[model samples]
Target: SNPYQRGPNPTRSALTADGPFSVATYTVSRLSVSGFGGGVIYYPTGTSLTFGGIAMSPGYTADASSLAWLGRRLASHGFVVLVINTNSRFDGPDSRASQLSAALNYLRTSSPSAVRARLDANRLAVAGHAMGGGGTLRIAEQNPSLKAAVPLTPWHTDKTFNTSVPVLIVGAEADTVAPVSQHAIPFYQNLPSTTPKVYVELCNASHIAPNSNNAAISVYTISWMKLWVDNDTRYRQFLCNVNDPALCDFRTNNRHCQ
Candidate 1:
């Protein structure tokens, strides 16, 4: 049960100015969840390191595992990704709210004399997969501190249409789990004009894009976060249209890089 591990077996993936930001793996059990995963921390010497994720399903172990892979990837990108276990409640609106709040509080209030320096509070973002994606939007709606959000194929109905954040809703035209019509469209249309939003529809993609071998959608998502969260200008193209299809990968149809 270590929350700082990046995988079951920690691996050193190079180092930055703060020396080797060790990547380790472990499990976290909180609020009745025993999540087996790992995380990587890039403590920039004097910077306080704070990182964590909102689990997809509160109280269910399997759903939480879906986000474990992000730890190492985000760590490599200079973030200490804390993947939490949200007890796997497939549709946990309240728990997701609490989890996000706690993470924000932890980052805001660092531990006594912590080795790491204080976080760039303004550069924080939250993301999720499937049900957790919906939860991410809900959390964003309630908490304004979130700098960015990426909800992957969220479950949207008539009720969960409004959110208040710079959200990237990644959807698959072929996703039957959370059909674009029922979930993605309604969710996107419900957002208030005041909120900055981007919606991507991956042609022929499905709910498993994040975990599947065909990684175009996943790569786009990472780039999207890097641009908005890390302020990486290299990914500026992904956010070209604040309300339109800013980034689309239809290479199979000659519409991807155009």
Candidate 2:
């Protein structure tokens, strides 16, 4: 068994439910932080097991509240999750990218002794929506050390990216703001073929689908991080087999499926 593995066996229903871990949360205020507007940190306190860390970012003009459920859910699933607010609500992808990194650093070094103690800083991941999703890709591209990335309905001007870090890009079919065809699909297609990646398009869903609790987004995201960041294979089944019709689009390189 993987030494980093936590929680129980996989179940389709369990993926969307609160995980086996009991969670706790704390906030870092903007006044006490720099490089990024501070947000909240959620972590699993039920066990002595050390867990991988993840930094989450919100979309343009949005705050941590929009992505709170997913962030807290991830913590309950056995990861240290930092849900961040950009220094400025209007921050662009590249700007948010920097903030994401700063947030990760804060989680690893500056969080209170208790929270920081539980994190395995080397195993880190990132997730974001829209412009924040764009930041996710930018940072993922820049940081090879990141274990995984999930960019939801990402909007970025630059398209080409090549990296070995596993990436799961979620898209929305009806997202006029950042349509899958123009943004998400092309972004996924241009990634290096050698990289492990997945593109799941939500049918008739808006760009903000990831802003609230979502089954497809939650299941695959947690599974991706569990499989990659935590180095746990129990989640491999979910990433390898997803038959949800809400996912109007699904594509992956053979590496992830295997």
Candidate 3:
């Protein structure tokens, strides 16, 4: 049986000018995490039923193209990355927990026969787009194992999670479906200052701006992953107090990133 509806093939295109990257489509089952590469593994290869950008309960959709690019960038930085699809049976907060649990499990245990030893579970991180973003928060909050999290345009909100963990919320200033004030902002505000949270608004961007056709958005996203997940110093300029228009310019549309 087919798992997605966006044509038979799940992958669509490549963005990087150079690299040895492989974007595969797959699924997973289980809970828990462990790794030390200071990188993140995006579980559930494809879209989520309600938050994967589709206005439906269940169906196949294309992977967030921008995320695909970010994954490749992370791989290029010497980080092992996996873009996967969680079990289709669950889509709500609880189900998201289960999906995250599986990712955590893979991080903690090494399948030497399956090439899992390459992962550094100690420095592992979690993130996702839309529903997956919400899922990452859920897992990061409930499980202390997660060192950091990057939720891209998350749809769910729950402020009870631990605020000590670092979180980066990526949103589009023009996104009405998941408005910053309504979704991303609230998520950011709920986290404590000590939590090390950063919210970036893509000026005049839509719900999928970061995942849209803009090459700049992709570049900024890669910088984010490298800085927060891989601990790369090259991306530090984008995160500091200085304003770098090339990396993340908020002056274009009355938008500000912090």
Judging by lDDT against the true structure, name the best candidate. 2
lDDT of candidate 3 over 1-258, digit per residue (tens): 312111121111222332333323222222322321112242222222110110001101324343655554544433445544445534554455555566456545642322243345555666666666776677777766455676776767564456455777777777776777777778887775567666777666777654534554444454455555544554545555635343332311111233
What do the candidate models score in CA lDDT, each in turn? 0.51, 0.89, 0.49
Full ranking by TM-score: 2, 1, 3
Q: What is the C-alpha RMSD of each candidate to the true structure, in Å?
A: 8.6, 1.0, 11.2
Candidate 3, residue 173: Cα displacement in angstroms equals 1.2
Model 2 residue runs over 4 Å out of place are none
**Higher-ranked by lDDT: 2 or 3:** 2
TM per model? 0.67, 0.98, 0.66
| Model 3 poorest 10 in a row by lDDT | 50-59
Any residue pairs clashing in model 2, and if so which?
none
Pitting candidate 2 against candidate 3, the one with the higher TM-score is 2
**Candidate 2 TM-score to native:** 0.98
In candidate 2, where is summed lDDT lowest over 10 consecutive residues? Answer: 249-258
lDDT of 1 at 29: 43
